[PDB]
């Protein structure tokens, strides 16, 4: 069932480091902000005309070191960048100038998260701490509880929780081999998740906000319930799964293995497609794997940022 094929449609060249992270806003479907190892963000405007799927719009210089995680705002006009210089930068997606410079992390920041609304900034850093900031730039909360580096923090979207609660729930994980849930208004702890043999590289709540998908070094992908606080399922990737992403339309998990990109069909608990682009002049042992994955707003296109300084887009082309 669902004989869905996805074919590479364009390549977004222009970066100079590994495209570490990607982000896309639901409101604005034709804009894609990507941060790389070249200490710069790039805003891409997508064109449905011919080979190249997008067009760079603005480069955001101002970061001294590696740019690790990138997050765009809900409205699609602001972008928060986490870099390896222990600072966070807020950028206007049109002006190109920085608005706020969040400072206070003693370790280089690995991940940042946007609030569901435009209120709070959640950042994870190597200093074993999480920081909650206002949009102005000051740090409101210093959440502790992790004894090691925290690699990833992305918010669980409130879908239909009771009506309304005004409570901000997200997850955090890193080299503590644990996954933690946090709730904000106040701004304290929630349930735990301990399933990983090795350390967690990346976690990601489902688009609805009721499934949390975590991955690590051993390629053991775990799916948990947050609102039910229990495990949902478990798979093995048998390679180094660098990043993973849910899909808005389909019930899918893209996983960036060290060999290629797997897609797992969640309802059938079986992988369906494997993505391995064709390079040239290599030795098959160092083919550029994927580090960033991001689906489109509708769920029709997939952006993968590799280690060869390239974004590649796979458009869903169902060949019957």
């Amino acid at each position: 069932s669902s004989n869905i094929m996805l074919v590479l449609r364009g390549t977004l060249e222009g970066h100079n480091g590994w495209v570490t992270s990607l982000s896309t806003s639901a409101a604005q479907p034709n804009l894609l902000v990507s941060g790389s190892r070249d200490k710069t963000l790039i805003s891409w405007r997508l064109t449905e005309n011919e080979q190249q799927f997008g067009v760079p719009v603005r480069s955001y210089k101002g970061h001294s070191h590696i740019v690790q995680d990138v997050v765009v705002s809900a409205d699609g006009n602001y972008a928060v960048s986490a870099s390896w210089d222990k600072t966070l930068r807020l950028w206007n997606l049109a002006t190109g100038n920085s608005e706020a410079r969040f400072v206070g992390h003693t370790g280089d920041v690995l991940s940042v998260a946007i609030d569901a609304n435009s209120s709070k900034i959640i950042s994870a850093s190597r200093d074993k701490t999480i920081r909650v900031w206002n949009t102005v730039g000051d740090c409101a909360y210093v959440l502790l509880g992790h004894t090691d580096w925290v690699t990833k923090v992305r918010v669980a979207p409130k879908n239909l929780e009771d009506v309304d609660d005004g409570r901000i729930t997200f997850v955090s994980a890193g080299m503590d081999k644990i996954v933690r849930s946090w709730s904000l208004n106040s701004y304290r702890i929630e349930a735990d998740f301990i399933g990983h043999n090795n350390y967690i590289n990346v976690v990601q709540p489902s688009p609805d906000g009721s499934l949390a998908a975590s991955a690590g070094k051993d390629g053991q992908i775990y799916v948990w319930n947050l609102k039910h606080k229990s495990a949902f399922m478990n798979f093995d990737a048998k390679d180094e799964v660098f990043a993973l992403a849910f899909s808005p339309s389909r019930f899918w998990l893209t996983a960036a293995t060290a060999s290629g990109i797997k897609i797992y069909d969640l309802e059938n608990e079986v992988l369906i497609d494997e993505l391995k682009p064709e390079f040239a002049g290599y030795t098959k042992a160092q083919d550029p794997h994927a580090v960033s994955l991001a689906w489109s707003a509708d769920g029709q296109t997939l952006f993968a940022g590799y280690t060869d300084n390239v974004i590649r887009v796979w458009q869903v082309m169902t060949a019957n």
Partner: peptide, 11 residues
């Protein structure tokens, strides 16, 4: 050109 014009122009 990078700051105020466009990316392709600067490239």
């Amino acid at each position: 050109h990078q700051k105020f014009v466009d990316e392709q122009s600067k490239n």
